[PDB]
């Protein structure tokens, strides 16, 4: 009677949305590019609220501009707001190189011709700044489909199309392209170490390491993406693409395969031990480079740590997970490796027809010994309502906008994915890879341990485990 079931939310409305809309994800893609300021064509909230969201997750400012759509543009069209916004950016930011022009619900409904505005602005910019090149990428992100997950993927693809259209194929680079998806700076730091230890040259798109920027004696601001125009252009010349996230950049790997014959390898997102193992085996396959002893050791240190926890504290404990689809499916697999039982998986957008085909579903169907409900098109009320109706959970894993569900239900909660604003430093802590699996397992245990103390639930047992 052992069943993994997919079902949609049964309400038309949303209470407590899991994700933001497409333009927010497009903004996130863009802020990882060096010398990039996205221009969000729509009303002002579509920009300012998302800059706040990034400040909540990262505790940093990122630069994004608005076209400031007002009432006259709503009657007559907003092309002149785009055109003005591009020139005002170029004139006031002399080092600016890349402007993704991101549409919103408003500017999709009114049908402004973004590509026509880009032709105008390219002519204007070439005349006014003869020795400068600014890349204007059209990013179509209506908010009434998909989510910030889809918007991220669309923006990455559009930027890559724009820049590679301009530079084409050159000399082979010998490098990998790597699209990790929507991950933290700590995940990027871990991936760079893995490629360094394996002696594999790679560009990570986007390289967000420096989002965790120092406060320096010289008062310098370093809070920027590290991925340059040149890095993106060089993607045409790669040996191969490693795509870690089906829903967060694999479509750019495919585009590069179609356009430039760079072979794309999509692998399971590397949450947990097996998925990391399989990622490293694919890297070895495509590069001919051996997996180093250092990664066998990091793997062994992670397993050693998780073995102190799994049968003692985790076995038979029931977990609900919410977040981006690649993260939810990957964390469900990690959970199983450590004897946790992920009985409720919530994925927050309208992409169910794709999720039903995800091979990780089948990997769960063939392995779980407990029923799993996967709710797609879910909101966070879908979690709260199930708890109120009697679902017994030992743990929630998800982002901070679900915090009150866990607090009020008195269920321990580990903060994963985006945004994680209600704890300190999580953006710096890997979640992927072997060290990430270890860090996740130890967050889970430490959340359970604190819960045992606050609730006086066998709190004396934390001595000789």
């Amino acid at each position: 009677p052992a069943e993994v079931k997919l079902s949609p939310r049964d309400r038309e409305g949303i209470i407590n949305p899991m994700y933001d809309c497409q333009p927010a994800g497009a903004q996130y893609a863009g802020i990882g590019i060096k010398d990039c300021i996205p221009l969000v064509h729509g009303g002002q909230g579509c920009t300012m609220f998302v800059r706040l969201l990034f400040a909540q997750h990262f505790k940093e400012n990122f630069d994004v501009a608005s076209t400031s759509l007002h009432e006259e543009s709503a009657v007559f069209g907003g092309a002149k707001r785009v055109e003005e916004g591009v020139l005002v950016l170029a004139r006031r930011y002399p080092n600016l190189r890349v402007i993704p022009i991101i549409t919103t619900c408003s500017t999709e409904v009114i049908g402004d011709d973004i590509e026509g505005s880009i032709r105008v602005c390219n002519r204007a910019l070439e005349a006014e700044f003869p020795d400068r090149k600014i890349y204007l990428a059209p990013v179509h992100t209506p908010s009434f489909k998909g989510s910030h997950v889809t918007g991220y993927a669309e923006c990455v693809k559009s930027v890559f199309k724009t820049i590679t259209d301009a530079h084409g194929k050159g000399q082979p680079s010998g490098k990998l392209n790597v699209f990790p998806g929507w991950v933290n700076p700590g995940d990027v730091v871990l991936l760079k170490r893995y490629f360094k230890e394996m002696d594999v040259e790679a560009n990570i798109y986007m390289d967000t390491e420096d989002f965790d920027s120092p406060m320096l004696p010289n008062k310098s601001i370093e809070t920027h993406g590290r991925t340059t125009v040149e890095d993106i252009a060089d993607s045409a010349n790669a040996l191969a693409t490693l795509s870690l996230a089906r829903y967060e950049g694999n479509t750019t790997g495919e585009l590069l395969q179609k356009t430039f014959a760079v072979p794309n390898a999509l692998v399971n997102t590397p949450y947990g031990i097996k998925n990391t193992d399989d990622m490293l085996r694919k890297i070895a396959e495509v590069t001919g480079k051996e997996i180093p002893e250092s990664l066998v050791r990091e793997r062994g240190i992670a397993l050693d740590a998780l073995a102190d926890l799994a049968h003692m504290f985790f076995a038979n404990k029931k977990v609900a997970i919410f977040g981006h689809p690649d993260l939810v499916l990957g964390l469900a697999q990690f959970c199983m490796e450590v004897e946790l039982e992920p009985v409720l998986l919530l994925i927050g957008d309208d992409q169910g027809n794709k999720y039903k085909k995800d091979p990780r579903i089948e990997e769960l169907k063939n392995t779980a010994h407990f029923d799993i409900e996967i709710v797609h098109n879910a909101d966070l009320w879908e979690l709260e309502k199930r708890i109120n109706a009697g679902l017994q959970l030992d743990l929630i894993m998800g982002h901070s906008k679900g915090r009150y569900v866990a607090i009020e239900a008195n269920i321990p909660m580990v903060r994963v994915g985006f945004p994680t604003f209600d704890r300190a430093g999580l953006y710096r802590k890997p979640s992927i890879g072997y060290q990430g699996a270890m860090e996740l397992g130890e967050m889970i245990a430490n959340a359970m341990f604190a819960h045992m103390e606050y609730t006086r639930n066998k709190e004396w047992i934390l001595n000789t485990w």
Partner: protein, 473 residues
């Protein structure tokens, strides 16, 4: 004079928005343009009209569904971002609602989607019987008639009451338009649609206070001590139905004249309720305000007992901070009113010199007030943008900036500390105790070892790492 900053040489229209107050000027010749269109591409701090209606005003209420008719982003974006507690477990902060508009609703209309969402929300939370519905950009563009849908829902569900606001983000130029549409709709439709028991000889509404970190609950300890019944708070720690009773008050006390002056003005026009403007931030300001309220009611002695007690309790701490904050330079980059509520109160009560101020969305009215109260040599900026903020820092070298968290995290890189001028650090900030809380946070922000440590380059052989000695009131 009016100022053309170097970063605005290619947008020189910005000079009419920036005033540097100089000796002997007739300030009537130098009033910034305000409440005009934004320049695209500037990194203006402005938000949208929907924000001003739902996030700022309507969403403060403790017992009301906030139904955002539009795609899900407008809902996501106004959830987990405000600090307005309630006395019912923070219902207002725990939830947000969307009609989850999809492409088919753009094509065919969203009215049935809204109607279904509204019934679902009432079904999911059977204890909640009040709702505000807001339009957003695309639902305005497709012409959904949310007032007509709300009328049908109320007919079908006679135990609910629904209010509607037409506030797409492209309306107006900023949050301000949302304030106006909400205020006028509420007084036109919902005031005097029920009544409550009057339990005091002295009754008032408190208009334009949104309970940031408990401000409203702190002020309520004053009204309870004075024996004044507050018919309605607009909208801090408020209820939908209290707001229906606003016509019953004898007096309207206004703090936020920008967001909420509209409804005070209409209550005076329609019901004869006088409008009293106060400053509920600032120590000596709070005393003036209590004295005015008590003079209106004829309870002067009770006012002087409360003031005396509050001064005995809090003035020694306030003066401790003044000794240490005297001469520090402050910038205030917020919505608008806090500029004119704070510039002279920090000067009087803390000795702090406000050297630069920027208003996201203030009107010319707000600039009249701030320039009247503010110092010579100070910059007064309407609709400031990020590059201007950097240039202003270079001109005035503030010791502390009161602004939102994102800007605070930016200026941290320049070793300038911030206090959250919107949601506070450790509030409340209104009232006598509140101004001490504000002073404490300013003191701990500036006299902070980390700021000194950041300046040391450990590679410089010539440099040592200092220790600083701090204090506490």
């Amino acid at each position: 004079p009016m100022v053309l900053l170097e970063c605005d040489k290619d947008i020189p229209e910005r000079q009419k928005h920036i005033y540097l107050k100089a000796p002997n000027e007739d300030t009537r010749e130098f009033l910034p343009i305000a409440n005009a269109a934004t320049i695209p591409g500037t990194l203006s701090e402005r938000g949208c009209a929907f924000c001003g209606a739902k996030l700022v005003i309507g969403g403060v209420l403790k017992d009301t569904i906030q139904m955002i008719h539009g795609p899900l982003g407008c809902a996501y974006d106004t959830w987990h971002t405000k600090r307005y507690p309630t006395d019912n477990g923070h219902f207002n902060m725990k939830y947000v609602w969307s009609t989850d508009m999809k492409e088919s609703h753009v094509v065919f209309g969203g009215e049935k989607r809204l109607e279904k969402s509204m019934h679902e929300a009432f079904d999911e939370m059977p204890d909640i019987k009040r709702m505000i519905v807001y339009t957003t950009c695309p639902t305005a563009l497709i012409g959904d008639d949310i007032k007509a849908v709300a009328k049908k829902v109320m007919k079908d569900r006679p135990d609910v009451d629904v209010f509607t606001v037409e506030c797409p983000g492209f309306s107006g130029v900023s949050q301000s338009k949302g304030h106006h549409v909400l205020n006028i709709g509420w007084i036109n439709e919902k005031v005097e649609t029920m009544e409550k028991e009057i339990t005091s000889e002295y009754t008032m509404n408190f208009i334009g206070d949104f309970n940031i970190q408990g401000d409203t609950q702190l002020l309520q300890t004053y009204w309870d001590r004075l024996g004044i019944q507050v018919v309605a708070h607009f909208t801090g720690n408020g209820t939908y139905d209290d707001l229906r009773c606003m016509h019953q008050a004898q007096l309207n006390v206004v703090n936020c004249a920008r967001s909420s002056g509209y409804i005070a003005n209409e209550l005076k026009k329609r019901y004869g309720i006088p409008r009293l403007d106060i400053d509920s931030w600032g120590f000596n300001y709070m005393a003036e305000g209590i004295r005015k309220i008590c003079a209106f009611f004829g309870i002067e002695e009770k006012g002087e007992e409360l003031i005396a007690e509050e001064y005995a309790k809090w003035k020694p701490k306030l003066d401790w901070y003044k000794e240490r904050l005297q001469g520090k330079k402050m910038a205030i980059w917020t919505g608008g009113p806090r500029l004119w509520h704070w510039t002279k109160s920090v000067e009087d009560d803390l000795g702090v010199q406000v050297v630069a101020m920027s208003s996201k969305f203030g009107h010319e009215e707000d600039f009249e007030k701030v320039i009247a109260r503010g110092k010579e040599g100070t910059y007064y900026i309407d609709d400031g943008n990020e590059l201007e903020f950097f240039e202003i820092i270079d001109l005035v070298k503030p010791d502390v900036i009161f602004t939102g968290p994102r800007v605070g995290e930016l200026v941290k890189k320049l070793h300038i500390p911030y206090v959250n001028g919107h949601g506070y650090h450790n509030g409340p900030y209104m009232g006598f105790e509140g101004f001490v809380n504000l002073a404490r946070d300013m003191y701990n922000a500036v006299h902070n070892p980390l700021r000194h440590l950041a300046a040391v380059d450990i590679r410089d052989k010539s440099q040592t790492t200092p220790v600083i000695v701090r204090g506490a009131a």
